Amino acid sequence: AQDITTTLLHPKGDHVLHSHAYPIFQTSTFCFDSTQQGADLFMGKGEGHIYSRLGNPTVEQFEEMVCSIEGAAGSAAFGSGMGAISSSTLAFLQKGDHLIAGDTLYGCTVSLFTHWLPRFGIEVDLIDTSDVEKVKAAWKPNTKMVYLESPANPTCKVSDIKGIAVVCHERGARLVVDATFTSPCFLKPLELGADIALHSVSKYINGHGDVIGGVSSAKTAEDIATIKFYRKDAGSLMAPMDAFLCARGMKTLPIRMQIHMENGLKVAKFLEQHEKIVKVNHPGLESFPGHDIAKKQMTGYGSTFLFEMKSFEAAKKLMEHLKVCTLAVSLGCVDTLIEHPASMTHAAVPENIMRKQGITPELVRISVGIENVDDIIADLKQALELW
Amino acid sequence: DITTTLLHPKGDHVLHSHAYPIFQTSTFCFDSTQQGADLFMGKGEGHIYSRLGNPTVEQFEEMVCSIEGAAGSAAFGSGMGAISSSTLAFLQKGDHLIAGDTLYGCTVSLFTHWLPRFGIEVDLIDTSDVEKVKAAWKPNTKMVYLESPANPTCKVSDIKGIAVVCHERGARLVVDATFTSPCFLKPLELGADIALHSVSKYINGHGDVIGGVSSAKTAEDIATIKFYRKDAGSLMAPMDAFLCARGMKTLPIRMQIHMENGLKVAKFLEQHEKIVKVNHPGLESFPGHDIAKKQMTGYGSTFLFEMKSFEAAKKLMEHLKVCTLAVSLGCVDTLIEHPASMTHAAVPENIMRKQGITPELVRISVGIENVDDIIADLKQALEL
Amino acid sequence: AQDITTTLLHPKGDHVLHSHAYPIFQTSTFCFDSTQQGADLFMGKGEGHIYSRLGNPTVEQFEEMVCSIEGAAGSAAFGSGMGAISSSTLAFLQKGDHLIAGDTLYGCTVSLFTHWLPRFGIEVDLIDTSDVEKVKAAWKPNTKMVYLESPANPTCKVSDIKGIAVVCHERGARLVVDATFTSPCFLKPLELGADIALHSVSKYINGHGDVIGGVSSAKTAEDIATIKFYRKDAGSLMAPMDAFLCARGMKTLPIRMQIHMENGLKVAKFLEQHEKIVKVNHPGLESFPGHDIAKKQMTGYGSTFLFEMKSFEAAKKLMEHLKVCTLAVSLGCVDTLIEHPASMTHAAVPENIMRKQGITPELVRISVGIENVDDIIADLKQALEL
Amino acid sequence: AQDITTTLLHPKGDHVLHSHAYPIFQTSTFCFDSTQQGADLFMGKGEGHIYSRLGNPTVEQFEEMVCSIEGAAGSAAFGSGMGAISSSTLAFLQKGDHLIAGDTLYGCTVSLFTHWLPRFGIEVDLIDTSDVEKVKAAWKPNTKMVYLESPANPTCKVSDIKGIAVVCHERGARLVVDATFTSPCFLKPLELGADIALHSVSKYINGHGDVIGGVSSAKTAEDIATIKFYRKDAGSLMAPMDAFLCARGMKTLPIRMQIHMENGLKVAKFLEQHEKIVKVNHPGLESFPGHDIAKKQMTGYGSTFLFEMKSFEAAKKLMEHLKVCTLAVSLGCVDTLIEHPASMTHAAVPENIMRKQGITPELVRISVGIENVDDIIADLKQALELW
Ligand SMILES: CSCC/C(=N\Cc1c(COP(=O)(O)O)cnc(C)c1O)C(=O)O
Ligand SMILES: CSCC/C(=N\Cc1c(COP(=O)(O)O)cnc(C)c1O)C(=O)O
Ligand SMILES: CSCC/C(=N\Cc1c(COP(=O)(O)O)cnc(C)c1O)C(=O)O
Ligand code: MET
C-alpha cells in the first residue's frame, strides 16, 4: 500500500498541456464544441466542463486529493468550513426532521444550528455526545442526522464516533463528522462509520493561514451528488486560486501533521507539569477523559488544545507576553497561535451552552505550529515566569 | 460621472500602495486580549478573520455600495450565494414568497426545490403585471423577488409599482439586476429593499471570476445578510475581489459599448428574414419597453431571439467564428447559448412553458468587439 | 479587416480544456512523454513546452496579443520595461560597437546607456534625434544601432522615426523604438521602418497600475530569436500571473486609449489657456514643435505630457493640493497621476544630460486617466486658484 | 540560539493592517505624501516605497527571509536563477576583467559565461575548481572573480569553497557561489568565505515546482546595493505573487530539506548496490571523490544526483517506465523528477565542455522528492527489473 505522502504528491488525473503543476483555471465559463456536446454535459452525459460553479478543473483536483485521503465516494470544496457545514446538513435536513448535535462545537456552527436551522422548521438538540446513552435518550422517530465534532473545538471533548455510528446505522440517520481539529491524516470518520466527513480547510489541510475554505466528503455517490446539488444553489464555492493554494498546502500535510502532533504533545506535557497551569485538555494525555476513545479511533492528534490558568489575569499576562506565539484566532497554521475562547472564538455562544461547554475566562487555547518545539516551550516558559 | 467614483474609492492606502493590496490571509493578529475582545463585540476599528471581513473584499463591497446608493454591500462566492443569502436570511417556516415566473435556471431550482423544504411557501407569478402580484398576495407574504429584465426572455417587471405594493403591505422587495448592471438599473433607487448581482457577469466583465454581491437599503438588513453569510459561508476570495474591483474600473465604459452594440445587433436581427422575433428591452416592438425606458437609464447587451426551427438555431450557433458557444453572459467577448437545452434545461416543464422557452430560442450576450465584426459573423452564419 | 478590438478579444491559439479564459500556468517545469520527445523539444523539433524560462503558455498568449497589434514576426515578454530595453540592446551590441540614442529618455534608460553599456565596451552617444541630420553627423563606422523614444519621457520631444529608419537601413544599423508613451494602438514603429518596437507594459498596455512588465517585438524571426536567447540567460521573465493580468488589461486597451487620448488633449488645451502656465508640451497641440511629424507618423496620442509652472514653489503648490490626481511616479494607469521629474523620475540623470534634456524644477508631468475629464479639469482649476 | 525553522516562520517586520499572512502588493506604483517626501525617497532618505522595480513590500519580505538564513548583509530577489546569476556577475565584471568559473555548471550558466560575457570584453576561463592548484594556475593580474557551483549540476562535483576563498581574499577577487543544489539549510557560502551566495529559488527554496525565481545575498551592504542597482536597470524582478509563493514555500524549507536529504541518501544507496547501476555520484556517499570536503563544508546534502547505467538504452528503459518519478527537467520539487542530461539539461553545452564535464548518454539525473522513500525505491526497482 502506497503511503499517503506519495498519494497526495501523485494525484489521479491527466496533466494539462504537459504542465507539471496543475494550472489555475481562473475562468467563469467553458466553450462547447457543438450544441449537442453542451446539451449532453448539462444532462451529465460525456466528459468536460460547463461553468465553474458546476465544476472547475483546479477545484476538482483539490477535491480528488481530499477524497483519496478520506476514502470517500467524492468530495466537494467550498468557500469556507461553514459553507461545507451548511451544505452537509441543509442539503439533507428539511422541515419536520430532527438533528442531534454535540453540545461543544465551533461557535458559528452553534450559531447555524441554533439560529438558522429552527427558522427552517428543523428541530435541533445539542447533546453531550461523549455519552452514547444520552444520544440514544435524545433520539426521536424523526431523527435524521447526528452531527459530531471530536475532539471538540475548543475543549477537545471526545465523542465515541464508532458507538454513535452503530445507532445512526440502525435507525436510518446520517452521521456527519467535523474532523477539522485532527486532519484526515489522523481521523478518518468514513472508516469509523460516518456518512460524511468535513473540514475547515482553512486550518491544517491548507496549513499556511492564507486561505479560507471548506471540504466535505461522502461515503456514497448519491450523498456527494446531493451535496454538490445544494452547493450549486447555495453558492459557497472554492475559488480557483484558493484551490491551487489548498492543493499546494496539502502537498506537505502528512509531514506537517507529524510535526504538529509531536510538538503539541510535548507542549502539552510541559504545560501539564508547570506550577501556573491548573489543567491541560489535550486528548493524547493519559489524564484526559476520553483519551482511551481518542487513541483507539484516531491514528494521531492535532496540536490545538486548551489549558486552564489560575485566573483570567494570569491568562492575559501569559497571552500578551509571548514572542513566538501569535495572539489571533484560527488554528492549524505552520506558526503557533494562541487565543482566549471566552472573549473571542466562543464569545457569541449563548450563556447556557457556554457553561454546558465548560468555557471559563481562565482558559487559553493554543494551536501549536511547526517551529522548533524547544523555542515554543522557551517562549511559554519565559512568559509564565514573568515578574 | 460613475467612472471617477469607481477609480477613486474612499479609504486609506495600505503602506502608500497605489493598487489596493491582496489580503490573501485567513486571520488577523491582536495587539492585546482587550483589543481582540473589543473587535468581537464590534467596538473599535480592525479585522479578525477573513470570513467576518477581509480588507480586499471590503474595498470591492464599498465600490458597489457607492454605486447602488446602499447602506452597505456584501460580496459572495457566486451570484447564487448572494441570492440565497438575500432571501433565506429573511424568510422562515410559515412565510410566503412571490417570485417572478421567469428567472435564471438555478434561482428556479432554489425557490422551487430548497425553499419549500424549509417550509417557505413560494408562488412564481407574472410580475410584468402588478395586479397579478396583488392577487397572489397572502397574509403571510414577506417578500417579492424579481429579475428585470428577466433571464433569458428579458420580460420587464414594474419595480417602482411593485415596491409601492411591498411598502404598503410589509414585505421586502429584492431585485436581481444582473442583466443590466448598476450603471443602468439601481433598484434601491426605485423603492426596492435589496439589489443583487451575479458579479460573474458585467460587473467583473472579464469572464475569469465567479462572484456575487448584495446591497441593502438599511443598515439592519445588510447586517442580517452578513450575519447569514458568516454561517452559510459563501465568501468572495481575496484574489477574486482584487479581480472584481479591477474589472469594475472599466465598468461604466464597457456598459456604454455593451449597450450600443446590443441595440445595433438586436436591430440587425430584427430585420433579418431568418429571425422570427427579438426580445430586447430597448426595442420599440418589445412589450415592456415603456416601463424599462422609464425605470432604467440604459440597457444590458444580453437578449433572446427566435429562429424558425431547432435545426435553424443549431446551424446558426454552430457556424459562428467570433461569437463563442458557451453559457454565462456579460463578458468582454460575445457569447451565445441555447436556453432550452443549456441554462434552463432543468426548469420544470410547466414552469418552462409559463416562461415561454422553446427549442427555437437562441440567447446572445453581445461583447465590446467592433459591432460590424459581430454583425458580419452572425450574417455569414445565418446566410451560409 | 477585422478590427483591433475584436483581434485582442479573439487571440489565436486553441483553448486549454475548453476553458474560456486562458489558464494561468503557474508552473516551472513540464512533463515529457518519452526521452525522445524531451530531446526533440530541446532541439526545437515538435510542439510543446519544457520549462517556463524557455516558454510558458500563459506568457506566450500575451506575447501573441502584442505581436498581433505590432505586426511583428514575434514578441518577447519580460519582468519589466527595463528588461525589455536591456534585452533589446545588449542582445545585439557588443564591445567595440557604437550606439546612438535620443538625448531625452526615461531616467533608468539613461542609467543603462550611460553607466552599464560603456563598462561592456560599447560606445554611446546621446544626441538630439528630433533632427535627422544630427543623427547623420553622429554616425561612425562602428554604429550598429539607433535607440529612440518618441514622444520622449518626459518632455514629449518627437523624432522622425521614419526618416531615421531610412538612414539605419542605408547604413546597416538596427532601429529600436520605445513606444511606451503612445501604446501600440497609436504608434507602430515596425510600420515606420523600425527593427524593434518595445514597451513598458507597466503603463498603458496593462493600464491598471498593478503590474510591472516589458515587451519587445521584432520585424524578423531571427531578431526575436536572438532576444529570447538573451532573455534565457539574462532572466528577466514575465510571471505567469502577471501575463494573465497583462492580457486581461489589454482586452480594454483600445477603448482605454481612445479615452486617454481625448481626455489628455482636453486637459492640455485647458492648461495651455490658463494664466498660471508658461507652456504645455503635448505633441497633439498645434503649438508644439514636431506636432506635424507626430500627426503623420502616429494614429493618436498618449495622455502623458509635461507643462511649465512660473516657479518651483508654484509647481509644489499645485502638485500638493490636488484631490483626484495622485502624486506618484509611473503613467498610463486608469487614474490620473502627477509627478515632478527634476526630483523624481529624472533625479538621477547627470546635470550634463539634464541640461540637454530641458528639465527644470518648474516642470510638472501629468498622466491623464480615464476619469470624467471634467473632474480632472475641476481638480486642476481648484488647485491653481489658491 | 533560535532554530532556523522558527526564524523562517517569524520573519522580522511589521504586520500590514494586522494581517497574519503578509499581503500581496500587486501594485506598480506607490503614493507620496508630498513632493519633499517623494524627493527624499529618491535620494534614499526616509522609510517608504516608490515603485515595485525599485522595491516591493511582498518581495522585500522574501528577501529578508533568505538574508536571515544566509547570514548576509542583504538579499535581492529576481525573476529567475539566471537573473540572479547575471546580476551577481555583470554588476561587478567589466571589460578587461577576468573571471575564473567552474567547468561543470548549469547549462545556461555556461551559455551566459561563454557567449555573453566575452561579447562584453570580459575574459573567462572554465577551470576544474575541485583542484585549488588549478585555480591558482589560472589566476591573472586582472582576475576579479571566481564563480563556483558545488556540488555541480549535474555531476555533483565538489569544490573546496573554503580553500578557494583564501586565494580570493588574498588577491582581491570576489567569490560567488551558486548553492541551488544544496539549499541554504545545508550550504552557507558566506560562512565559508564567499562574498555572494545565490540560488535558483525555482528549485528547493520554493520547493513546489510552481515558480521561477532567483535570489542573491551579499556579505557586504555595498555589494548588495550594487547588485540592486544592476537589477533596476537590467530588470529581472520577482513578481509580487511569485514572492508571496516563494515565502510560503520557504516556510517548510527546513523540514522538506531534512526529508529530501534522508530520501536522497537512501535512494543513492539502493542504486549503488543495484546490479544494473555502474556508479552513483551522490556527494554523501563514501565512494564519492569529494565526499570528505562536502562533509566538512556542508551540514547536509540536497537530493539531486546522478547515476550511470550500462547503456543509453538501459537509461531510457528506466526513465520511461517509472510510475511515481516524473520525466522532466528541473529539481528540488516535493515530488521526484528524473531527466537525461546528455539529451536535455546539458544538450546545449559545447562538446569541448561536455567531454570534460564527464557527461555521457549513460547518465541519468534524479531529483528525489519527499514521497515515502520505500515507494520511490519500489518504483525504481520495478523499472530496473523489467522484462
Ligand atoms: C470565531 S473565528 C475563528 C475561526 C475558527 N474555527 C473555524 C472552524 C470551522 C469554520 O471554518 P471556516 O472558518 O468557515 O473555514 C469549522 N469547524 C471547526 C472545527 C472550526 O474550528 C477558530 O478559531 O476556532
Ligand atoms: C450554469 S449557467 C451560467 C450562469 C448564467 N447566469 C447566472 C445568473 C445568476 C447566478 O450567478 P452565479 O452564476 O452564481 O455567479 C444570478 N442571476 C442571474 C440573472 C444570472 O443570469 C447564465 O448563463 O444565464
Ligand atoms: C522613476 S520610476 C517610474 C517609472 C516610469 N517610467 C518607466 C519607463 C520605462 C521602464 O519600464 P519599467 O518601469 O521597467 O516597466 C521604459 N520606457 C519608458 C518610456 C518609461 O517611461 C515613469 O514614471 O516615468
Ligand atoms: C533549460 S533546463 C532548466 C531546469 C534546471 N536548471 C535543471 O537543471 O534542470
Q: Would you mind describing this structure in some detail?
A:
The complex is a heterotetramer, with three copies of chain A and one copy of chain D (387 residues). Chain A has 387 residues and is of the alpha/beta class. In chain A, 37% of the residues lie in helices and 14% in strands. Chain A folds into two domains: 2-253, Type I PLP-dependent aspartate aminotransferase-like (Major domain) (Aspartate Aminotransferase, domain 2); 254-387, Aspartate Aminotransferase, domain 1. Chain A has helices at residues 4-9, 35-42, 57-70, 81-89, 107-119, 132-137, 161-171, 221-234, 240-250, 253-272, 291-297, 312-319, 351-356, 373-384; strands at residues 74-78, 98-102, 123-127, 143-149, 174-178, 196-200, 214-218, 279-281, 304-308, 326-327, 337-339, 363-367. In chain A, the strands form two sheets. Chain A has a seven-stranded mixed β-sheet, with helices on both faces. In chain A, strands 8-9-12-11-10 form a five-stranded mixed β-sheet. In chain A, helix 3 (57-70) runs parallel beside helix 9. The radius of gyration of chain A is 21 Å and the shape is globular. The N and C termini of chain A lie far apart (55 Å). Chain D has 387 residues and is α/β, with parallel strands linked by helices. Chain D folds into two domains: 2-253, Aspartate Aminotransferase, domain 2, CATH 3.40.640; 254-387, Aspartate Aminotransferase, domain 1 (Alpha-Beta Complex), CATH 3.90.1150. Helices cover 38% and strands 14% of the residues of chain D. Chain D has 14 helices and twelve strands. In chain D, helix 7 (161-171) links the parallel strand 4 and strand 5 (174-178). In chain D, helix 3 (57-70) runs parallel beside helix 9. The termini of chain D are far apart. The relative contact order of chain D is 0.13. Chains C and D meet through helix 2, helix 4, helix 5, helix 8 and helix 9 of C and helix 2, helix 4, helix 5, helix 8 and helix 9 of D. One ligand 2LM sits between chains A (80-82, 106-107, 149, 153, 178, 180-181, 200, 202, 212, 214, 329-331, 345) and B (49, 51, 233). Chain C: Its cofactor is pyridoxal 5'-phosphate.
